[PDB]
From Swiss-Prot, chain A:
Disulfide bonds: none annotated. The chain holds residues 146 to 249 of 536 of the full protein. Expressed ubiquitously. Expressed in the skin (at protein level). Platelets, neurons and osteoclasts express 5-fold to 200-fold higher levels than most other tissues. Part of a complex comprised of PTPRA, BCAR1, BCAR3 (via SH2 domain) and SRC; the formation of the complex is dependent on integrin mediated-tyrosine phosphorylation of PTPRA. Interacts with DDEF1/ASAP1; via the SH3 domain. Interacts with CCPG1. Identified in a complex containing FGFR4, NCAM1, CDH2, PLCG1, FRS2, SRC, SHC1, GAP43 and CTTN. Interacts with ERBB2, STAT1 and PNN. Interacts with DDR1, DDR2 and DAB2. Interacts with CDCP1, TGFB1I1 and TOM1L2. Interacts with the cytoplasmic domain of MUC1, phosphorylates it and increases binding of MUC1 with beta-catenin. (Microbial infection) Interacts with HEV ORF3 protein; via the SH3 domain. Belongs to the protein kinase superfamily. Tyr protein kinase family. SRC subfamily. Residues 6-103 form the SH2 domain. The phosphorylated form is termed pp60c-src. It is found in: Cell membrane; Mitochondrion inner membrane; Nucleus; Cytoplasm, Cytoskeleton. This is Proto-oncogene tyrosine-protein kinase Src. Non-receptor protein tyrosine kinase which is activated following engagement of many different classes of cellular receptors including immune response receptors, integrins and other adhesion receptors, receptor protein tyrosine kinases, G protein-coupled receptors as well as cytokine receptors. Participates in signaling pathways that control a diverse spectrum of biological activities including gene transcription, immune response, cell adhesion, cell cycle progression, apoptosis, migration, and transformation. The modification Phosphotyrosine is found at Y42. It comes from Homo sapiens (Human).
Amino acid sequence: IQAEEWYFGKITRRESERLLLNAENPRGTFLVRESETTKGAYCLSVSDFDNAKGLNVKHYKIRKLDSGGFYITSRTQFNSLQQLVAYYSKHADGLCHRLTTVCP
Amino acid sequence: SIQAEEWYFGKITRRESERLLLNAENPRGTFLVRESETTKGAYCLSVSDFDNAKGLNVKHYKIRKLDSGGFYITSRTQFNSLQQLVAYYSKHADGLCHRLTTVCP
């Protein structure tokens, strides 16, 4: 996974908001990094825009089932992280926006 | 002028540096210096490394600028230029994952 373009490893929540919040990035720009807060979990950080708050980043915890798979909600589970990224690029399913560009 | 240094890569992102450095053709210790995207005014030394478990990986060390003039990564040694910092760590790792060997192509 270290060689996945979208995996940024151990950056913090505040580093990921600085990397993403760029007023020249499309809505849905994202990255996957490790959760600082929950050992063993990952986190999908996604840039969003709404009228009021403007540009902001949403963070979604990704948990790993002990049998192996990954999930953000009870709707779908994925046998790998790349399957999760691939799925949410085509279907937002509760996320603020489908995933569009990897963080530059 | 640092703009023209072989090892200086300006404003490339954290992601681009890793894309440059994670490559089978690079020795452990391949590096580049760039601006930090996350801390303005700071630079960053990115270094390719290899460990048996994770294979090829990149480590990133922030380089802080003393307002008085120097540059540092640790309290052990400070430097008056980035050329000096790059030269020193090419001779001694001193906490880095590996001595700097190859300038990133």
